[PDB]
Amino acid sequence: MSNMEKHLFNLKFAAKELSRSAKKCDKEEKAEKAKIKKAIQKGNMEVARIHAENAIRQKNQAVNFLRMSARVDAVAARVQTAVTMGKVTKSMAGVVKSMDATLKTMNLEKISALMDKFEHQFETLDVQTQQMEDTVSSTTTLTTPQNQVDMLLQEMADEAGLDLNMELPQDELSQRLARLRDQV
Amino acid sequence: MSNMEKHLFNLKFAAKELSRSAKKCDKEEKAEKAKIKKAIQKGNMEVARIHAENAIRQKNQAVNFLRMSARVDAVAARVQTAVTMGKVTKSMAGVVKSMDATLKTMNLEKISALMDKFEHQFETLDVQTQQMEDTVSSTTTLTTPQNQVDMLLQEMADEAGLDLNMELPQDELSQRLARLRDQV
Amino acid sequence: RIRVEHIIREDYLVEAMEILELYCDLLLARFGLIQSMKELDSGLAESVSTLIWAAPRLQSEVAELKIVADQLCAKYSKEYGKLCRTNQIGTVNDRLMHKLSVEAPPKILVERYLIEIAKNYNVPYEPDSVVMAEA
């Protein structure tokens, strides 16, 4: 617990202690009022006056405690802002320091390099997959004759009612831009 | 327990002790009154008078204890203010001292600097995210052809009844203020 | 009036950033020439000189722009770099130099800004009669 969190804890506690003191005074104004009535009915006017002075005293104590509690709450509410905004400021300071370190060790030029290398190394893995698959294809050529695959596709297309002939080797902006390159 | 909290504890205790003494006197006025009646019925006028003098004595003791209890409460209520307002004053003194230290070590010029650095370092992280995403985009260009995405958007828009054509590349104060800059 | 001077300057700066973005993209498009020749081409002279001129003004915001300028000076020599920074080379883009000037906006521009902003937000405003007359 921080030195300021201790002070906030004590201010919150004092505010509640004053609020309880106001509640105790109010409940004792009610208790003393009951005793005035009893003393009047018994004709004990001296004792009635002692209770009357207690009732009016605890009525006024209650307002003073209530008012002080309100003031100590207002102060406790402000030190809460100071405690929380301190925690936020230290966390931001820490983030700034951490990111300053990582932006040094991996600056944008180094990121640029790493991303270029990443892309170029997956181009190479595409070249490698292609030639593994071309090898496997030639390896098992006799297990998949071309004409048998073509005929199975045509049969399944006929069943589906699809008009596309499957034996055959089955954008204009690109074509026009090509014609421009030839024309110049 | 503070030296003043001890005094408050003893004042609160004395106030209750006097209040109990008043209650004991009242209950013994009732007890002695009962004994007067018994003595009168038995014709023991000397014993009746002894009880009568006790009854009137304890009636008057009760008022003196009640009055003293009220006065000691009034004093106990004031030392409660002094104890509580002392705790509040020390806590405020402590807050002032703590904040004086932190406002030195992190003054507003230093905060200004830290906030500038924070903002500028997140500009850099935006530049870095952008070029990671541009790399990944170019890396997997063949997995997402533009025309296929456009056609899927148009198909889903047709189903939704939305009129916006999705193949195409789909404020006036800014425009007018620009025209002003050109006119001067 | 004094708050719109900040807005005018930021608006001019955004327009200047668009011009520099275009010249960097031009040096990338014609990067073959930069790397090939040892002489500076005419087509690139505007772009190269302007980027060297702008870097000391902008390098607070755009830190990499310093490195671009330093490399272009290493390529075409320090002396060319000095002739650029003063525009003795007479090739730096005029509109950009205007847009990054330190001079205060004209009073009539400030008034016209307030008129347009006031109109847009439906706020009553009466412009400075002296300024509107001087225009």
Short mmCIF file of C-alpha atoms in Angstrom, two decimals:
data_model
loop_
_atom_site.label_atom_id
_atom_site.label_comp_id
_atom_site.label_asym_id
_atom_site.label_seq_id
_atom_site.Cartn_x
_atom_site.Cartn_y
_atom_site.Cartn_z
CA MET A 1 0.00 0.00 0.00
CA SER A 2 1.45 3.29 -1.28
CA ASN A 3 1.90 6.23 1.09
CA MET A 4 -0.97 8.04 -0.74
CA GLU A 5 -3.18 4.94 -0.67
CA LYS A 6 -2.73 4.95 3.11
CA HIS A 7 -3.90 8.58 3.27
CA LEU A 8 -6.88 7.83 1.05
CA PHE A 9 -7.76 4.85 3.25
CA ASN A 10 -7.70 7.04 6.34
CA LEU A 11 -9.75 9.82 4.70
CA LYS A 12 -12.43 7.36 3.57
CA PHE A 13 -12.48 5.95 7.11
CA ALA A 14 -12.85 9.38 8.76
CA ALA A 15 -15.71 10.24 6.39
CA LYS A 16 -17.62 7.09 7.46
CA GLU A 17 -16.86 7.67 11.14
CA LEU A 18 -18.42 11.15 10.90
CA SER A 19 -21.41 9.74 8.99
CA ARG A 20 -21.97 7.13 11.74
CA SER A 21 -21.66 9.90 14.35
CA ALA A 22 -24.44 11.84 12.59
CA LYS A 23 -26.68 8.73 12.54
CA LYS A 24 -26.06 8.13 16.25
CA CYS A 25 -27.01 11.73 17.08
CA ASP A 26 -30.24 11.49 15.04
CA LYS A 27 -31.30 8.25 16.74
CA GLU A 28 -30.58 9.89 20.14
CA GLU A 29 -32.65 12.98 19.30
CA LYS A 30 -35.56 10.50 18.90
CA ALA A 31 -34.67 8.76 22.17
CA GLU A 32 -34.49 12.04 24.14
CA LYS A 33 -37.76 13.31 22.63
CA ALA A 34 -39.50 10.20 23.99
CA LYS A 35 -38.11 10.99 27.46
CA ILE A 36 -39.41 14.58 27.34
CA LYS A 37 -42.98 13.27 26.83
CA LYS A 38 -42.67 10.81 29.75
CA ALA A 39 -41.29 13.53 32.05
CA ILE A 40 -44.08 15.99 31.11
CA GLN A 41 -46.78 13.36 31.84
CA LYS A 42 -45.19 12.77 35.30
CA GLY A 43 -44.97 16.55 35.96
CA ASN A 44 -41.12 16.42 36.28
CA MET A 45 -40.52 19.75 34.49
CA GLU A 46 -36.84 19.99 35.54
CA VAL A 47 -36.10 16.54 34.06
CA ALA A 48 -38.20 17.39 30.98
CA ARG A 49 -35.98 20.45 30.37
CA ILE A 50 -32.76 18.39 30.71
CA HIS A 51 -34.03 16.01 27.99
CA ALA A 52 -35.20 18.97 25.87
CA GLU A 53 -31.71 20.49 25.97
CA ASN A 54 -30.19 17.08 25.07
CA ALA A 55 -32.64 16.65 22.14
CA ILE A 56 -31.82 20.10 20.73
CA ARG A 57 -28.08 19.54 21.31
CA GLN A 58 -28.02 16.20 19.46
CA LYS A 59 -30.13 17.70 16.66
CA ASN A 60 -27.40 20.29 16.09
CA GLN A 61 -24.43 17.92 16.57
CA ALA A 62 -25.97 15.70 13.84
CA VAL A 63 -25.88 18.56 11.30
CA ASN A 64 -22.25 19.42 12.16
CA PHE A 65 -21.09 15.80 11.73
CA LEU A 66 -23.13 15.45 8.52
CA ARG A 67 -21.57 18.63 7.10
CA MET A 68 -18.03 17.59 8.10
CA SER A 69 -18.60 14.11 6.60
CA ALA A 70 -19.62 15.75 3.30
CA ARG A 71 -16.42 17.86 3.31
CA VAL A 72 -14.12 14.91 4.10
CA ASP A 73 -15.85 12.85 1.33
CA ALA A 74 -15.19 15.69 -1.14
CA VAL A 75 -11.48 15.56 -0.21
CA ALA A 76 -11.37 11.72 -0.29
CA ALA A 77 -12.91 11.90 -3.81
CA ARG A 78 -10.06 14.18 -4.94
CA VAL A 79 -7.23 12.06 -3.54
CA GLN A 80 -8.89 9.09 -5.37
CA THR A 81 -8.29 10.98 -8.65
CA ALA A 82 -4.66 11.65 -7.61
CA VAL A 83 -4.00 7.97 -6.72
CA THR A 84 -5.63 6.62 -9.94
CA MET A 85 -4.10 9.21 -12.30
CA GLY A 86 -0.70 8.51 -10.72
CA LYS A 87 -1.06 4.77 -11.52
CA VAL A 88 -2.07 5.68 -15.09
CA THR A 89 0.86 8.08 -15.49
CA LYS A 90 3.41 5.53 -14.28
CA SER A 91 1.94 2.89 -16.60
CA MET A 92 2.14 5.22 -19.56
CA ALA A 93 5.69 6.14 -18.64
CA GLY A 94 6.50 2.43 -18.58
CA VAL A 95 4.87 1.79 -21.93
CA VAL A 96 6.80 4.66 -23.48
CA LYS A 97 10.05 3.25 -22.17
CA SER A 98 9.28 -0.28 -23.34
CA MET A 99 8.24 0.79 -26.82
CA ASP A 100 11.30 3.03 -27.11
CA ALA A 101 13.47 -0.04 -26.61
CA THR A 102 11.59 -2.25 -29.04
CA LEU A 103 11.42 0.41 -31.75
CA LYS A 104 15.22 0.66 -31.53
CA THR A 105 15.90 -3.12 -31.72
CA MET A 106 13.34 -3.58 -34.50
CA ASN A 107 13.19 -0.33 -36.39
CA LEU A 108 11.13 0.11 -39.53
CA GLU A 109 14.09 -0.47 -41.84
CA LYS A 110 14.70 -3.77 -40.12
CA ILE A 111 10.99 -4.65 -40.33
CA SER A 112 11.02 -3.76 -44.00
CA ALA A 113 13.87 -6.18 -44.50
CA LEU A 114 12.26 -8.97 -42.50
CA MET A 115 9.00 -8.67 -44.38
CA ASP A 116 10.78 -8.74 -47.74
CA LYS A 117 12.67 -11.85 -46.71
CA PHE A 118 9.47 -13.51 -45.42
CA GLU A 119 7.73 -12.94 -48.73
CA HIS A 120 10.66 -14.08 -50.85
CA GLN A 121 11.11 -17.28 -48.80
CA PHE A 122 7.47 -18.31 -49.39
CA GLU A 123 7.97 -17.76 -53.08
CA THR A 124 10.69 -20.39 -52.80
CA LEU A 125 8.48 -22.79 -50.88
CA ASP A 126 5.88 -22.46 -53.65
CA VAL A 127 8.55 -23.42 -56.18
CA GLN A 128 9.44 -26.41 -54.03
CA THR A 129 5.83 -27.61 -53.55
CA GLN A 130 5.27 -27.33 -57.27
CA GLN A 131 8.14 -29.65 -58.10
CA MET A 132 7.27 -32.15 -55.39
CA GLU A 133 3.79 -32.34 -56.88
CA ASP A 134 5.16 -32.57 -60.43
CA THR A 135 7.37 -35.46 -59.36
CA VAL A 136 4.52 -37.32 -57.66
CA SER A 137 2.35 -36.71 -60.69
CA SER A 138 4.94 -38.23 -63.07
CA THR A 139 5.63 -40.97 -60.49
CA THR A 140 2.02 -42.23 -60.60
CA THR A 141 1.21 -41.40 -64.24
CA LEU A 142 0.04 -44.93 -64.99
CA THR A 143 -2.40 -44.94 -62.11
CA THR A 144 -4.21 -41.86 -63.52
CA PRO A 145 -4.42 -41.93 -67.34
CA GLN A 146 -5.64 -38.58 -68.72
CA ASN A 147 -8.41 -40.04 -70.89
CA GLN A 148 -9.98 -41.93 -67.97
CA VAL A 149 -10.17 -38.76 -65.88
CA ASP A 150 -11.65 -36.83 -68.80
CA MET A 151 -14.31 -39.51 -69.35
CA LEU A 152 -15.27 -39.63 -65.67
CA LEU A 153 -15.66 -35.83 -65.63
CA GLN A 154 -17.80 -35.94 -68.80
CA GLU A 155 -19.99 -38.73 -67.34
CA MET A 156 -20.52 -36.81 -64.07
CA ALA A 157 -21.23 -33.58 -66.03
CA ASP A 158 -23.82 -35.44 -68.19
CA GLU A 159 -25.55 -36.69 -65.00
CA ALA A 160 -25.52 -33.12 -63.58
CA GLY A 161 -26.94 -31.68 -66.85
CA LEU A 162 -23.86 -29.42 -67.20
CA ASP A 163 -23.12 -28.52 -70.86
CA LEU A 164 -19.33 -27.97 -70.48
CA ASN A 165 -17.34 -30.49 -72.61
CA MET A 166 -14.62 -31.88 -70.29
CA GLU A 167 -12.10 -33.32 -72.84
CA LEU A 168 -11.31 -29.82 -74.24
CA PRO A 169 -8.86 -27.20 -72.79
CA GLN A 170 -11.63 -25.08 -71.23
CA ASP A 171 -10.25 -9.66 -68.63
CA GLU A 172 -10.82 -7.30 -71.59
CA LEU A 173 -9.09 -4.41 -69.74
CA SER A 174 -5.88 -6.50 -69.63
CA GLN A 175 -6.29 -7.22 -73.36
CA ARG A 176 -6.74 -3.52 -74.22
CA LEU A 177 -3.77 -2.43 -72.06
CA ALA A 178 -1.68 -5.07 -73.88
CA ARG A 179 -2.76 -3.64 -77.27
CA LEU A 180 -1.63 -0.18 -76.05
CA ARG A 181 1.87 -1.55 -75.26
CA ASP A 182 2.11 -2.98 -78.81
CA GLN A 183 0.84 0.26 -80.44
CA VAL A 184 3.54 2.55 -78.95
CA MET B 1 -4.59 4.47 21.06
CA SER B 2 -3.60 8.15 20.95
CA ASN B 3 -3.36 10.16 24.18
CA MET B 4 -6.52 12.10 23.12
CA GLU B 5 -8.35 8.90 22.16
CA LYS B 6 -7.68 7.69 25.71
CA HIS B 7 -9.25 10.88 27.12
CA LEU B 8 -12.25 10.55 24.82
CA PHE B 9 -12.65 6.92 25.89
CA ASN B 10 -12.67 7.93 29.54
CA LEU B 11 -15.11 10.82 28.97
CA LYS B 12 -17.55 8.56 27.12
CA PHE B 13 -17.24 6.04 29.97
CA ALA B 14 -17.90 8.65 32.69
CA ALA B 15 -20.97 9.88 30.79
CA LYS B 16 -22.45 6.34 30.76
CA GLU B 17 -21.55 5.73 34.41
CA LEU B 18 -23.50 8.87 35.39
CA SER B 19 -26.42 7.82 33.16
CA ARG B 20 -26.52 4.39 34.87
CA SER B 21 -26.38 6.13 38.26
CA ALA B 22 -29.45 8.18 37.31
CA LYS B 23 -31.33 5.01 36.24
CA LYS B 24 -30.43 3.28 39.50
CA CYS B 25 -31.73 6.24 41.53
CA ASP B 26 -35.03 6.29 39.58
CA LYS B 27 -35.61 2.56 40.09
CA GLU B 28 -34.89 3.04 43.83
CA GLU B 29 -37.34 5.94 44.13
CA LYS B 30 -39.97 3.40 42.95
CA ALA B 31 -38.70 0.78 45.42
CA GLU B 32 -38.78 3.20 48.39
CA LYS B 33 -42.26 4.49 47.45
CA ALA B 34 -43.55 0.90 47.69
CA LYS B 35 -42.06 0.64 51.21
CA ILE B 36 -43.77 3.87 52.34
CA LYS B 37 -47.18 2.37 51.46
CA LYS B 38 -46.43 -0.87 53.37
CA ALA B 39 -45.24 1.07 56.44
CA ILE B 40 -48.35 3.33 56.43
CA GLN B 41 -50.67 0.28 56.27
CA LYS B 42 -48.83 -1.23 59.29
CA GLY B 43 -49.01 2.11 61.19
CA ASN B 44 -45.16 2.37 61.40
CA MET B 45 -45.05 6.16 60.84
CA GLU B 46 -41.37 6.49 61.85
CA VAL B 47 -40.32 3.86 59.27
CA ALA B 48 -42.69 5.43 56.70
CA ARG B 49 -40.87 8.77 57.14
CA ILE B 50 -37.41 7.15 56.70
CA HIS B 51 -38.56 5.68 53.36
CA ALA B 52 -40.18 9.00 52.39
CA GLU B 53 -36.89 10.82 52.94
CA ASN B 54 -35.05 8.15 50.92
CA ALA B 55 -37.59 8.42 48.05
CA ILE B 56 -37.26 12.21 47.89
CA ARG B 57 -33.44 11.97 48.18
CA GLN B 58 -33.11 9.48 45.30
CA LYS B 59 -35.54 11.56 43.22
CA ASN B 60 -33.16 14.51 43.52
CA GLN B 61 -29.92 12.52 43.12
CA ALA B 62 -31.35 11.17 39.82
CA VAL B 63 -31.73 14.71 38.41
CA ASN B 64 -28.18 15.68 39.45
CA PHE B 65 -26.64 12.59 37.80
CA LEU B 66 -28.80 13.08 34.69
CA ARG B 67 -27.71 16.73 34.42
CA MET B 68 -24.02 15.87 34.95
CA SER B 69 -24.27 13.06 32.36
CA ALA B 70 -25.66 15.56 29.84
CA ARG B 71 -22.73 17.94 30.51
CA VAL B 72 -20.06 15.21 30.22
CA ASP B 73 -21.70 14.00 26.93
CA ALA B 74 -21.51 17.57 25.57
CA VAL B 75 -17.77 17.60 26.34
CA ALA B 76 -17.23 14.06 24.95
CA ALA B 77 -18.98 15.22 21.73
CA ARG B 78 -16.47 18.08 21.40
CA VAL B 79 -13.34 16.00 21.96
CA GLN B 80 -14.76 13.63 19.25
CA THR B 81 -14.56 16.57 16.80
CA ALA B 82 -10.99 17.31 17.94
CA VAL B 83 -9.86 13.66 17.52
CA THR B 84 -11.50 13.28 14.06
CA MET B 85 -10.42 16.68 12.71
CA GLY B 86 -6.87 15.93 13.89
CA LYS B 87 -6.85 12.66 11.87
CA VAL B 88 -8.16 14.58 8.85
CA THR B 89 -5.55 17.33 9.24
CA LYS B 90 -2.66 14.86 9.47
CA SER B 91 -3.96 12.99 6.41
CA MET B 92 -4.19 16.19 4.42
CA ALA B 93 -0.72 17.19 5.54
CA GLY B 94 0.51 13.81 4.33
CA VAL B 95 -1.22 14.13 0.98
CA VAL B 96 0.27 17.58 0.47
CA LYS B 97 3.73 16.24 1.18
CA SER B 98 3.30 13.24 -1.12
CA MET B 99 1.95 15.27 -4.01
CA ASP B 100 4.71 17.85 -3.56
CA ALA B 101 7.24 15.10 -4.18
CA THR B 102 5.49 13.61 -7.19
CA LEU B 103 4.86 16.98 -8.82
CA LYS B 104 8.61 17.62 -8.59
CA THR B 105 9.70 14.24 -10.07
CA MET B 106 7.06 14.43 -12.79
CA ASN B 107 6.43 18.08 -13.46
CA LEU B 108 4.16 19.28 -16.23
CA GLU B 109 7.02 19.89 -18.65
CA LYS B 110 8.11 16.31 -18.17
CA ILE B 111 4.52 15.09 -18.60
CA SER B 112 4.23 17.16 -21.75
CA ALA B 113 7.31 15.43 -23.09
CA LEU B 114 6.14 11.95 -22.14
CA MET B 115 2.76 12.45 -23.76
CA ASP B 116 4.35 13.73 -26.96
CA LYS B 117 6.63 10.73 -27.08
CA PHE B 118 3.73 8.34 -26.38
CA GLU B 119 1.75 9.76 -29.28
CA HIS B 120 4.66 9.78 -31.71
CA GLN B 121 5.59 6.17 -30.87
CA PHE B 122 2.07 4.94 -31.72
CA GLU B 123 2.28 6.76 -35.01
CA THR B 124 5.30 4.56 -35.69
CA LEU B 125 3.49 1.39 -34.67
CA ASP B 126 0.71 2.30 -37.12
CA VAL B 127 3.33 2.59 -39.86
CA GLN B 128 4.68 -0.81 -38.88
CA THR B 129 1.26 -2.55 -38.77
CA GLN B 130 0.46 -1.11 -42.17
CA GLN B 131 3.52 -2.63 -43.78
CA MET B 132 3.10 -5.98 -42.07
CA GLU B 133 -0.41 -6.10 -43.49
CA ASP B 134 0.76 -4.95 -46.93
CA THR B 135 3.35 -7.72 -46.93
CA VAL B 136 0.84 -10.39 -45.93
CA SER B 137 -1.56 -9.08 -48.54
CA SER B 138 1.04 -9.37 -51.33
CA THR B 139 2.19 -12.71 -49.85
CA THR B 140 -1.26 -14.30 -50.33
CA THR B 141 -2.36 -12.41 -53.46
CA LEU B 142 -3.16 -15.60 -55.34
CA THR B 143 -5.41 -16.89 -52.61
CA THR B 144 -7.64 -13.77 -52.85
CA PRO B 145 -8.06 -12.57 -56.46
CA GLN B 146 -9.73 -9.14 -56.60
CA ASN B 147 -12.44 -10.13 -59.10
CA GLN B 148 -13.61 -13.07 -56.98
CA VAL B 149 -14.05 -10.84 -53.93
CA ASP B 150 -15.90 -8.24 -55.99
CA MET B 151 -18.26 -10.90 -57.38
CA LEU B 152 -18.99 -12.37 -53.94
CA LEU B 153 -19.81 -8.89 -52.61
CA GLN B 154 -22.10 -8.20 -55.59
CA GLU B 155 -23.87 -11.57 -55.14
CA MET B 156 -24.42 -10.94 -51.40
CA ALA B 157 -25.61 -7.36 -52.13
CA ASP B 158 -28.10 -8.70 -54.75
CA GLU B 159 -29.48 -11.16 -52.15
CA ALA B 160 -29.78 -8.30 -49.60
CA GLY B 161 -31.54 -6.04 -52.16
CA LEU B 162 -28.76 -3.42 -51.77
CA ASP B 163 -28.34 -1.26 -54.92
CA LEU B 164 -24.63 -0.39 -54.43
CA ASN B 165 -22.49 -1.77 -57.32
CA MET B 166 -19.50 -3.50 -55.66
CA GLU B 167 -16.97 -3.67 -58.58
CA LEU B 168 -16.67 0.17 -58.72
CA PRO B 169 -14.46 2.44 -56.50
CA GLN B 170 -17.37 3.53 -54.27
CA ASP B 171 -17.61 17.23 -46.59
CA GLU B 172 -18.61 20.36 -48.56
CA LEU B 173 -17.12 22.65 -45.86
CA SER B 174 -13.69 21.07 -46.52
CA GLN B 175 -14.23 21.60 -50.27
CA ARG B 176 -15.15 25.29 -49.80
CA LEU B 177 -12.21 25.95 -47.45
CA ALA B 178 -9.93 24.37 -50.09
CA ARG B 179 -11.37 26.71 -52.77
CA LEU B 180 -10.56 29.66 -50.46
CA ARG B 181 -6.90 28.57 -50.24
CA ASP B 182 -6.70 28.46 -54.07
CA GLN B 183 -8.42 31.87 -54.48
CA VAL B 184 -5.92 33.85 -52.34
CA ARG C 1 -9.32 34.66 -35.46
CA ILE C 2 -6.14 33.41 -33.77
CA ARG C 3 -7.44 29.84 -33.54
CA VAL C 4 -8.15 29.69 -37.31
CA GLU C 5 -4.50 30.57 -38.00
CA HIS C 6 -3.66 27.13 -36.55
CA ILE C 7 -6.26 25.51 -38.83
CA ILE C 8 -4.97 27.28 -41.95
CA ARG C 9 -1.41 26.21 -41.18
CA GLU C 10 -2.37 22.55 -40.63
CA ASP C 11 -4.45 22.59 -43.83
CA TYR C 12 -1.49 23.98 -45.79
CA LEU C 13 0.77 21.37 -44.19
CA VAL C 14 -1.55 18.53 -45.26
CA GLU C 15 -1.41 19.88 -48.82
CA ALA C 16 2.39 20.00 -48.58
CA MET C 17 2.55 16.38 -47.37
CA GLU C 18 0.53 15.36 -50.45
CA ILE C 19 3.15 17.05 -52.68
CA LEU C 20 6.07 15.30 -50.98
CA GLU C 21 4.23 11.96 -51.12
CA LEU C 22 4.02 12.44 -54.89
CA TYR C 23 7.75 13.23 -55.25
CA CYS C 24 8.80 10.21 -53.17
CA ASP C 25 6.54 8.02 -55.33
CA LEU C 26 8.13 9.58 -58.42
CA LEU C 27 11.68 8.76 -57.27
CA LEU C 28 10.50 5.18 -56.67
CA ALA C 29 8.92 4.98 -60.12
CA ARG C 30 12.12 6.20 -61.76
CA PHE C 31 14.51 4.56 -59.32
CA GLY C 32 16.23 2.76 -62.20
CA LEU C 33 17.53 6.13 -63.47
CA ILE C 34 18.73 7.23 -60.04
CA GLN C 35 20.71 4.02 -59.61
CA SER C 36 21.96 3.91 -63.24
CA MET C 37 23.31 7.42 -63.97
CA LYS C 38 25.78 9.51 -61.97
CA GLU C 39 24.28 12.77 -63.27
CA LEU C 40 20.92 14.10 -62.08
CA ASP C 41 18.19 13.87 -64.75
CA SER C 42 15.96 16.88 -65.55
CA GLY C 43 12.81 14.88 -64.86
CA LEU C 44 14.01 14.22 -61.32
CA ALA C 45 15.54 17.61 -60.53
CA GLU C 46 12.32 19.09 -59.10
CA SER C 47 11.70 16.06 -56.92
CA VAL C 48 15.24 15.61 -55.64
CA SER C 49 15.79 19.31 -54.88
CA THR C 50 12.39 19.71 -53.18
CA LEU C 51 12.93 16.65 -50.96
CA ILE C 52 16.32 17.99 -49.84
CA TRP C 53 14.82 21.46 -49.23
CA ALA C 54 11.84 20.11 -47.25
CA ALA C 55 13.65 17.65 -45.01
CA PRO C 56 14.94 20.21 -42.41
CA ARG C 57 11.42 21.71 -42.17
CA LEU C 58 9.57 18.38 -41.87
CA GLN C 59 12.05 16.10 -40.07
CA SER C 60 10.41 16.82 -36.70
CA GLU C 61 7.33 14.93 -37.95
CA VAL C 62 8.72 12.63 -40.65
CA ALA C 63 11.99 11.29 -39.28
CA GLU C 64 12.79 9.09 -42.29
CA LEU C 65 12.73 12.18 -44.53
CA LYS C 66 16.09 13.13 -43.06
CA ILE C 67 17.60 9.83 -44.27
CA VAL C 68 16.08 10.30 -47.72
CA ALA C 69 17.69 13.76 -47.92
CA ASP C 70 21.04 12.53 -46.60
CA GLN C 71 21.16 9.74 -49.19
CA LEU C 72 20.23 12.11 -52.05
CA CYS C 73 23.05 14.42 -50.92
CA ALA C 74 25.45 11.45 -50.80
CA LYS C 75 24.42 10.59 -54.37
CA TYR C 76 24.53 14.03 -56.00
CA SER C 77 27.18 15.56 -53.66
CA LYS C 78 27.06 17.82 -50.58
CA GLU C 79 27.42 21.00 -52.65
CA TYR C 80 24.24 20.25 -54.60
CA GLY C 81 22.63 19.56 -51.21
CA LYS C 82 23.56 23.06 -49.98
CA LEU C 83 22.32 24.73 -53.16
CA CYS C 84 19.00 22.92 -52.63
CA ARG C 85 18.46 23.93 -49.00
CA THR C 86 18.58 27.66 -49.93
CA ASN C 87 16.91 27.16 -53.35
CA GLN C 88 19.97 28.77 -54.99
CA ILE C 89 19.49 25.82 -57.38
CA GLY C 90 16.21 27.52 -58.43
CA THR C 91 14.41 24.17 -58.87
CA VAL C 92 12.49 23.61 -55.58
CA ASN C 93 8.71 23.54 -56.11
CA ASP C 94 7.20 26.99 -55.50
CA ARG C 95 3.78 25.89 -54.22
CA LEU C 96 5.39 23.63 -51.64
CA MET C 97 7.68 26.43 -50.41
CA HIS C 98 4.65 28.70 -50.05
CA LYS C 99 2.72 26.04 -48.11
CA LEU C 100 5.57 25.55 -45.61
CA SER C 101 6.24 29.30 -45.13
CA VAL C 102 6.40 30.68 -41.60
CA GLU C 103 4.48 33.86 -42.54
CA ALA C 104 1.11 34.62 -40.96
CA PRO C 105 -1.97 33.96 -43.16
CA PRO C 106 -3.48 37.00 -44.98
CA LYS C 107 -6.17 38.73 -42.91
CA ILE C 108 -8.76 38.18 -45.68
CA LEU C 109 -8.09 34.41 -45.61
CA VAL C 110 -8.72 34.35 -41.84
CA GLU C 111 -11.99 36.28 -42.27
CA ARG C 112 -13.16 34.04 -45.14
CA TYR C 113 -12.41 30.96 -42.99
CA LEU C 114 -14.57 32.33 -40.16
CA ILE C 115 -17.38 33.20 -42.62
CA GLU C 116 -17.46 29.65 -44.03
CA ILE C 117 -17.19 27.93 -40.64
CA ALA C 118 -19.87 30.19 -39.14
CA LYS C 119 -22.21 29.52 -42.09
CA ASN C 120 -21.70 25.74 -41.85
CA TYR C 121 -22.39 25.57 -38.08
CA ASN C 122 -25.27 28.13 -38.37
CA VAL C 123 -23.55 30.60 -36.04
CA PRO C 124 -24.13 34.38 -36.52
CA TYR C 125 -20.86 36.07 -37.46
CA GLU C 126 -20.09 39.58 -38.71
CA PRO C 127 -16.67 39.88 -40.45
CA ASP C 128 -14.13 42.66 -39.92
CA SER C 129 -15.32 45.50 -42.19
CA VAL C 130 -11.79 46.93 -42.55
CA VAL C 131 -10.36 43.60 -43.81
CA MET C 132 -13.30 42.98 -46.18
CA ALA C 133 -12.78 46.52 -47.57
CA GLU C 134 -8.98 46.12 -47.96
CA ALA C 135 -9.62 42.99 -50.09
#
